[PDB]
Amino acid sequence: MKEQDSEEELIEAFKVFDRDGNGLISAAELRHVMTNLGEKLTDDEVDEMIREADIDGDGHINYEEFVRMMVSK
């Protein structure tokens, strides 16, 4: 019906980089991490995903809303 190969993997994958404790990630550090790894994640592509994720106050980003909208729409 509606798999969750990305949702579950995204929530879990991000969880590994949890800092806030509740379930958030810093875009500042998250940028260098992802870009520095994988297939050299572009700085532009990472800037978009993080911008739509949330980013409030300093740089807190909940991977629940980000993943939610990522699949919800």
């Binding site: 990305s6 993997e9 879990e12 992802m34 790894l37 994988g38 990472v46 995903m49 990522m70």
Partner: peptide
């Protein structure tokens, strides 16, 4: 003490690929 951090970073990277794509079929 395997760096599982990078691993999760690979799969999550795949999500971004689908994210940028997904919402982009026609009109």
């Amino acid at each position: 003490k395997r760096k599982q951090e990078e691993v999760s970073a690979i799969v999550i990277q795949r999500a971004y690929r689908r994210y940028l794509l997904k919402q982009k079929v026609k009109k």
